[PDB]
C-alpha cells in the first residue's frame, strides 16, 4: 500500500532555506550549461547511497570544499537512490532500503526525502539519477541536477520525464559509446510532451510538460574512454551540428576509468590539462567518491560503496584542488 | 482528466472468444520460444496504426493467410500503438489519435482497446510494442505477444514491465547492434521484481511480479545487418552461454533492411534459405507490411504508413508464401 | 470496482439542451423561492424509479401538461433514485438496479444518469432526494431541484451537502412534524461549509462550499397533517422570525395524506382553496403520481410503484387542472 | 490536499497495547449489551475535546477511578471530535483544530489520532460520536464505543456506517424524544448493507458490511426527560417487541439535565436508586465531565468546556462513587 507523495511532503515540507538553495543552484547550473559562467560543475560523491548517516558525514566534509572553491567550482553532491543493474541486483535505497530483499519502498522513499532535505538544509545541493517514472514526485523538489543514465538516454519515457523536470539534466552517452543518442535526447527533452504520469496524490493523469531548456550531454566512456580533448572537440562539433549546447560534462568514472577507481584521478588530470590549454567546451565533471575507497559486497565497513568502487576522502581532496587550480586559470582568460 | 483502465474495461469487456484466442496464442508462442513446436511465428503488419479502418481491412486480408498457412506459420498482426521517435514526432495513436497535436489520450486508449477487441473477436491475435509504463493496463489483456524496442531493451523499467506481462516478450538488440543487452534483458525479465506501477483503478501501488518465462531476443540489425546464418549461429551460442533460450526472432525491417522497405524480401529469402538448410534456432520473423507500400509524412493515402516505410499487400502475399514453403520443409525433417 | 463519476460523464456528457433546461429551471425555481414569480412549482411523479421505460412514458405524458400549464405551474418530474427506509428494504435504483439483491451500483449509476439525460433532452426537468453523500457527483448536473428527506433534514452532513449543490433545495419537516429543524437547515445550508467529500475522479478531498441561497421548507406532515392555512400561517411567521424565505412547499403525500394515496387530492383541494383566498406563502406542491395508481411488493405490473402508493394518471390530470385554475386566480391579483 | 488515512496510520500505527485494549474493551461492552456481565458502562468526559493536554490530564485522573471501580463500572472516556450544531458553529477539533476558522482538517485528523493513541497507550479506552462518513477511517481503530447522535439516528447513511463499525454503537433517541427511530436504527445497523464509502487509501468504493450485533439505544431526553424507571420500563418493552436487546444506556446530560449541568448528579442519583431497587435493563450511563465545571465561549480557562457545560472533577468523583456503590449492590443480587 503505497503512500502518495503528499504524505511525505506533509511530514517533510521543503524549507525556505532548501527551496532557496535548490532554486539558485539550478539557475547557477543553467548558466554553466549555456556558457554564461565558466565555473566547473562538479557532481561528486558515492556511486549509491546505502547509509544516510555516512552520507551526512560525507556531505559535511564536502561542504567545506564547496565553500572554499566556490569561485572556480560549483560542487553538488551525488545522492543516487536508484541504480540500473546490468541484469539483476540491488536497485538502491528507495527500492530496498533495509538492504535485505524486503523492498520496503515506503520507508525508502521517506528516508530518501529526509536525507535530501537535511542535505539542502545544511547548504549542500544534491543530484540523482532519475530512473523510475513514479518516484520523482517524492523528492524532485530537493534536486538541483539530474542524470539520465547510459542505459536509458535513448528511452522516450526518460526523455519525457526529463522534459518535465525543473532542474538541469545531463544525458549520458550509451554503454558502447554512442553520443548521438544523448544529442537526440537533448532535442527531445527540450520540447513539450504529453504523456501519462502520476500526481502528488498518487493518481495517474495526463502530464503536459513545457520542455527543459537546460539539458546537456555527459561523456562516460564506451568500448573505449571518451574524455580526451580529441573526443571533446568531436562531441562539440556534433552538438553544434544539432543546434544544441556544445557545453558538456565529463564523467571520470564508469567506462572512462574502466571500473578502476584509481584512474578517476588520471582522467581528472587530463581534464585539468584541457582546461589549462583551452577546454572551452567543458562545463562540468562527475566523480565517484566516498569516505573510504574501494567497494564491498556487503555493507560491513562504514562509508564504503556496495556498488561501484569509489575514491576515498583523501584522493577526493586532491582531485578537487587539482580541478579548482586548473579552472582558475581557465577563468582568468 | 484521465479515465482509469476500469472505465475502458467496463465499456469493452474481453469476450469469451477473445480471451480464448489470447490464451491459446500465448501458449502456442511459448511453445515456439522453448522449442516444443517448429512453426514459425510471424509478427506482421504496419509500422504503426494510425487508422482503425485500414487496420481492420488489413486484418481481414491477413486472416485468410493466417488460416491458409496455419500448419507452417503462426501469424499474429502488428498492432503498434506507441512509437519511439529519434528526437520528436508523432508517438502513436494512443498519444495523439486525431493526428493533429490535440493529444486526446482518453479517446486514443478507448480506440486502441476497441480495435484490439474487434481484431481478436474476428480471429486475429495482436502484438504490440510496450513502450509506456501506464498504458498497458488498458489493453494488455488483448495482446498475445509483446516487443520491447531497441531503444528500451537496456532500460530497467522496461525489463520490470516485461517481468509482469502475461504474454511472451521479444527484446530487440540495441540500435547499434548490441545483442548482449537483449540477453541480459531476458535474464532480468525472467526474475521477480518489485517496483512502482499504477493499478486498474488509476492509483499508484507497489507491484510484485513473478517473472516472465517466455522472453526471447529479436535480431533487427545495427550498424550492419544481423539476419544471416553466421549471425544467427553466433547469437545462439551467446544465448546458450547465458543459460537462456537459443530460439530467436529475426526482423526483416529496420536496420536489417537498412531502412529500405524493398529489402525486407531479401532478408526473408535469406531466412527461407536458412530454414531449408537447417535454421533450427529460428522461431520467428518480423515484417513491416501495409495495404500499400512506402511511407508519407501526412495521412493522405489510405493504407500507407506515416512512420517507417512498409512493403505493400502483394509483396506480403509473396513473402508469406516464401516462408511457409520453406518452413514446411524444415518441419518435415 | 466503483467507477468514478468521470467514467459516466465521459459516456453521457450533458448536452447543450439539457444544460440550458437545467440552468433555466433552477433560475425559475429560485424566482419562486424568493417570491419574484407566483407560478406554482409542482414536483410530481413516482415515489421511486424502478423502471426507466415507464419513467420515460410517464414523462412524455407529463410534458404535455407541463407545456399546457406553463403560465400558472412549473412542472418538474420526481425521479427519485435513493429511498430512505424505516429499518431495511430496497434503497432504490442506484443501490440495487436489478431489484434482486445484487447491488450492481455501477449499472445503477449509469442507468440513473442515462434516464436523467434522456428526460432533460426531451424537455422534462428532474428532481430527486439527495440521500447519499457520494452518489450526487454522478448526476447532480442533471437535477433542477433537490429534496432533503424528513429523516435527514436534521443531519449536519446533509445540510453540508445542500450547501454545495447548485440547485434549489427543499428541506422536509421531521417525521413527527418538527418544523424548526427545516428552518434550522435553511440557515445552515445558506452558509459556507468545510467538510470531506469525494471528487469526480473518485478521490476524497476537502470541500469548501459557498452556501445555497435557494433553500426552503416542505410541509409533509407529522403526527398530524400540516398542509392547512393555519399551519402555513404558523410556518410563515417562524420563517420570517429566522430571517429566511417565508415561501414554502406543501407535500400532498406521506404524512399529510396519512400515507393514503386517495387523500392526496383532498390535500391538493385544500391548497387550491388557499390559493384562491390568498395563499401568498405557498410556492410549490409535491405529489406522488405514476401511470397506474397504488403500489405492489414485486415489480409485476408496469408503471406501478413498489414503494409508496401513488395516484394514477387520470387523477393526476384532475389534480393539475385544479391547481392551475386556482393559481391563475392568485396570479391575476 | 487531503491526506488519506494511510498517511496517518503510517505515522501513528496502533501499538500492541492499544490494539489489545480496544479489542478487550469492545468485547467487555458487548458483554454488557447482551446481559452477560452486569457492570455498568460509564461513558464520561468532556462534551468536546479542544485541548489535547487537558484531555490527557483528565484521562490520567479518570484512569485511577477506572481501576478502582473496575469490578462495578467499566469506565471509558468521552473523546468527542465531531459536534452536530443546531444551525451553525464549531463542528469540533477535526473540522477546525486551531479554533479560529482556518479549517485545518489534515492537522485536526493527525491531532485526533495522536490523542487517541496516547489515551489507549496509557490504559484509557476512548469513545466518540461518529458524525461524518469519511473521517472514521482515520481513527476508528482506536475507538472502543461509538455513538450516533440524536440528529442522525434516523439517517440511513449513519445506520449504514454503524453496520460496518467494529465497536459497539449507541443510538440516541431523537431530539424531541422519539425512541422508535433508535430501535429501528439497531434493527437497520444489525444487517448487512451495500453503499459507497471511502477506503483507507482515500478512494471511493463499494462497501459491503456484515452488520453490527452490539448496538443499543441511549435515552437522552426530548420534550421531557426519559431517565426514570417508568421511561426505562417502556423503552425495554418496545425493545423486546422489536426483537432487539433490551439493555440500554441513559445519558445524564443533554435533554435529561436540560438547562442545569449540575442536574446530572440528580439523574445519576435516580439511576443509582433504580440500580438498587432492580434496574435490570440499564447497561450504561453517559456523563459530561471535565477538570473544571461550567463552560466558556472562548478557550480561556484550562480544562473547561467550550461547548456544553460539564461537571468538574470533585463532582465526578462523587458521581462515580455513587454509581459504583449502587451497582455493586445490583451485581450482588
Ligand atoms: Cl551491475
Ligand atoms: Cl419504509
Ligand atoms: Cl429508486
Ligand atoms: Cl471536538
Ligand atoms: Mn556508479
Ligand atoms: Mn518501424
Ligand atoms: Mn414516497
Ligand atoms: Mn454535549
Amino acid at each position: 500500500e503505497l503512500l502518495p507523495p503528499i504524505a511525505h511532503l506533509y511530514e517533510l515540507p521543503i524549507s525556505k532555506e532548501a527551496s532557496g538553495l535548490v532554486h539558485r543552484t539550478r539557475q547557477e547550473i543553467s548558466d554553466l550549461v549555456h556558457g554564461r559562467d565558466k565555473r566547473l560543475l562538479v557532481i561528486i560523491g558515492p556511486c549509491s547511497i546505502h547509509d544516510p548517516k555516512a552520507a551526512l558525514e560525507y556531505a559535511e566534509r564536502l561542504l567545506k570544499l564547496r565553500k572554499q572553491y566556490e569561485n572556480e567550482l560549483l560542487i553538488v553532491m551525488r545522492v543516487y537512490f536508484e541504480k540500473p543493474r546490468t541484469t539483476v541486483g540491488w536497485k538502491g535505497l528507495i527500492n530496498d532500503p533495509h538492504l535485505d530483499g524486503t523492498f520496503d519502498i515506503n520507508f525508502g522513499l521517506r528516508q530518501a526525502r529526509s536525507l535530501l532535505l537535511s542535505l539542502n538544509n545544511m547548504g549542500m545541493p544534491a543530484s540523482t539519477e532519475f530512473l523510475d517514472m513514479i518516484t520523482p514526485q517524492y523528492y524532485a523538489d530537493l534536486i538541483s541536477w539530474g542524470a539520465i543514465g547510459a542505459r536509458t538516454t535513448e528511452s522516450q519515457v526518460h526523455r519525457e520525464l526529463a522534459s518535465g523536470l525543473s532542474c538541469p539534466v545531463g544525458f549520458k552517452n550509451g554503454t558502447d559509446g554512442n553520443l548521438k543518442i544523448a544529442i537526440d535526447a537533448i532535442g527531445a527533452a527540450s520540447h513539450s510532451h504529453h504523456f501519462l504520469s502520476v500526481t502528488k496524490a498518487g493518481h495517474s493523469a495526463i502530464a503536459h510538460t513545457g520542455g527543459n531548456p537546460d539539458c546537456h550531454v555527459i561523456l562516460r566512456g564506451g568500448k573505449e574512454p571518451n574524455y580526451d580533448a580529441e573526443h571533446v572537440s568531436e562531441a562539440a562539433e556534433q552538438l553544434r551540428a544539432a543546434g544544441v549546447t556544445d557545453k558538456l560534462m565529463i564523467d571520470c568514472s564508469h567506462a572512462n576509468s574502466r571500473k578502476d577507481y584509481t584512474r578517476q584521478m588520471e582522467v581528472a588530470q587530463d581534464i585539468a590539462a584541457q582546461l589549462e590549454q583551452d577546454g572551452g567546451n567543458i562545463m562540468g565533471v562527475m566523480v565517484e567518491s566516498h569516505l573510504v575507497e574501494g567497494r564491498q559486497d556487503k555493507p560491513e565497513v562504514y562509508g564504503k560503496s556496495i556498488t561501484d568502487a569509489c575514491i576515498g576522502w583523501g584522493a577526493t581532496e586532491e582531485l578537487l584542488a587539482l580541478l579548482a587550480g586548473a579552472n582558475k586559470k581557465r577563468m582568468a582568460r
Side-chain angles (χ1 to χ4, degrees), chain A residues 130-222 224-229 231-246:
Chain A
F130 289 102
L131 179 50
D132 186 275
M133 291 303 106
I134 293 169
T135 60
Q137 287 280 30
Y138 292 90
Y139 62 80
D141 62 315
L142 299 164
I143 297 296
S144 291
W145 181 91
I148 303 292
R151 292 171 188 78
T152 43
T153 281
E154 213 172 0
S155 163
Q156 193 162 256
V157 304
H158 290 83
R159 288 160 176 198
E160 286 170 357
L161 178 58
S163 86
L165 286 173
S166 303
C167 55
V169 170
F171 283 101
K172 288 188 141 189
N173 63 249
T175 50
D176 290 329
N178 184 318
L179 181 59
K180 185 166 194 299
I181 67 170
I183 302 183
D184 294 342
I186 290 168
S190 69
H191 283 65
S192 180
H193 292 266
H194 290 67
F195 57 91
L196 304 191
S197 195
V198 178
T199 67
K200 287 175 158 59
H203 317 126
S204 56
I206 301 166
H208 178 182
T209 63
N212 187 331
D214 301 322
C215 299
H216 61 92
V217 306
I218 306 165
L219 295 183
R220 52 74 75 195
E224 318 269 39
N226 63 3
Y227 62 80
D228 70 18
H231 287 86
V232 167
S233 179
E234 197 221 339
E237 170 73 346
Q238 293 173 41
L239 288 159
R240 283 189 296 274
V244 301
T245 186
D246 60 4

Side-chain angles (χ1 to χ4, degrees), chain A residues 266-276 278-283:
Chain A
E266 293 187 42
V267 174
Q269 280 161 331
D270 194 278
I271 293 163
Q274 288 181 62
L275 290 170
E276 290 176 71
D278 177 1
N281 299 106
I282 306 179
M283 50 72 58

Side-chain angles (χ1 to χ4, degrees), chain A residues 5 15 72 76 112 130 150 153 185 194 199 205 254 256 270 310 315-316 323:
Chain A
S15 62
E72 293 69 53
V76 178
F130 289 102
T153 281
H194 290 67
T199 67
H254 305 102
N256 280 333
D270 194 278
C310 297
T316 298
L323 293 182

Side-chain angles (χ1 to χ4, degrees), chain A residues 63-66 68-80:
Chain A
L63 177 69
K64 291 156 137 291
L65 301 179
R66 164 176 159 86
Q68 187 170 331
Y69 303 127
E70 70 186 358
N71 303 121
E72 293 69 53
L73 306 183
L74 185 48
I75 287 162
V76 178
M77 191 172 160
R78 280 183 55 113
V79 191
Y80 281 45

